Scaffold this active site. Structure first.
Site, mmCIF file in Angstrom:
data_model
loop_
_atom_site.group_PDB
_atom_site.id
_atom_site.type_symbol
_atom_site.label_atom_id
_atom_site.label_comp_id
_atom_site.label_asym_id
_atom_site.label_seq_id
_atom_site.Cartn_x
_atom_site.Cartn_y
_atom_site.Cartn_z
ATOM 1 C CG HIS A 67 31.294 51.221 41.907
ATOM 2 N ND1 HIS A 67 31.257 50.047 41.283
ATOM 3 C CD2 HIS A 67 30.008 51.649 42.055
ATOM 4 C CE1 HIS A 67 30.010 49.746 41.059
ATOM 5 N NE2 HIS A 67 29.275 50.720 41.522
ATOM 6 C CE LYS A 68 28.033 55.481 40.848
ATOM 7 N NZ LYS A 68 27.025 54.855 40.015
ATOM 8 C CG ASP A 97 34.184 48.730 42.091
ATOM 9 O OD1 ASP A 97 33.521 48.924 43.116
ATOM 10 O OD2 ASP A 97 33.649 48.553 40.998
ATOM 11 C CB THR A 142 23.859 51.520 38.567
ATOM 12 O OG1 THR A 142 23.581 50.254 39.154
ATOM 13 C CG2 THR A 142 24.073 52.566 39.662
ATOM 14 C CB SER A 171 26.653 49.403 39.031
ATOM 15 O OG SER A 171 26.001 48.771 40.157
ATOM 16 C CB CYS A 172 22.080 47.299 38.265
ATOM 17 S SG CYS A 172 22.363 46.928 40.010
#
Length: 256
Positions: A234-235, A206, A10, A79-80
């Site tokens: 999240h990770k 998350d 990300t 993520s992104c």
């Protein structure tokens, strides 16, 4: 079956975020490439040299171009990273067996490329101690950012060990969401991006891509397969590395 996974970090991160998952997938017999994108990880460019999300995605595009005819890969983006998958699939969809979204944005083809990012900024508006700056590149003013250490600690690496969180404070760099250029970018196409198989992996624990946002995305652009990992943060490639490699083995066994 064995597959060739291309892991895509990300913004503000690098290939290093995959340092636990890449040896585990290799221990299952897979080939793994973990790229540094433009001005990310140990890439020599600085973010002020990057004018778009497409230019940011250059290492992934160059990598796919270097694949010999007939070689397919499974993209995995965190993520992104989902936006880099969409840009790549509009140029090299025939080289993509499947794309796996890992607590990731899921762009679509009916709205503009920034749509999902705009909705993320609505669901998660306070980025705490994250700092912002502006630079100019190719006529446009781009807002850069550097993720705040408390945002990193509490929302991205919530349940990660202190030595993992330490790697994030040491290695995260200046980045950009390029939100303004994504909003004016041409839409992702139905024949490129829309044609690839899409597997959505997430955890409801998350703390930045909240359940409202992730369930909103599944509803907006229906994935071919959905995997929900219990717990973690999240990770997930750090807190649930084994469960992510088990999911990716099934994807390698399902999509080629």
């Amino acid at each position: 079956a064995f597959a060739h996974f291309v892991l895509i970090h990300t913004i503000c991160h690098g290939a290093w975020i995959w340092h636990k998952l890449k040896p585990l997938l290799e221990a299952l017999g897979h080939k793994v490439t973990a790229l540094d994108l433009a001005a990310s990880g140990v890439d020599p460019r600085q973010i002020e040299e990057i004018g778009s999300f497409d230019e940011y995605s250059e290492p992934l595009l160059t990598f796919l171009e270097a694949l010999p005819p007939g070689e397919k890969v499974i993209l995995v983006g965190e993520s992104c990273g989902g936006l880099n998958i969409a840009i790549a699939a509009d140029k090299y969809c025939e080289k993509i067996a499947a794309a796996v979204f890992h607590n990731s944005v899921l762009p679509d083809t009916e709205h503009c490329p920034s749509y999902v990012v705009d909705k993320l900024m609505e669901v998660f508006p306070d980025w705490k101690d994250t700092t912002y700056f502006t630079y100019t590149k190719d006529g446009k003013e781009i807002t850069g950012l550097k993720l705040g250490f408390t945002l990193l600690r509490e929302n991205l690496y919530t349940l990660c060990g202190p030595e993992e969180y330490e790697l994030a404070k040491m290695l995260t760099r200046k980045g950009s969401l390029f939100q303004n250029i994504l909003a004016k970018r041409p839409f992702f196409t139905k024949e490129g991006y829309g044609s690839i198989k899409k597997i959505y992996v997430w955890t409801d624990q998350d703390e930045i891509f909240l359940p409202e946002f992730q369930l909103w995305q599944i509803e907006n652009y229906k994935p071919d397969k959905v995997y929900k990992v219990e717990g973690g943060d999240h990770k997930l490639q750090l807190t649930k590395t084994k469960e992510i490699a088990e999911i990716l083995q099934e994807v390698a066994d399902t999509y080629n």
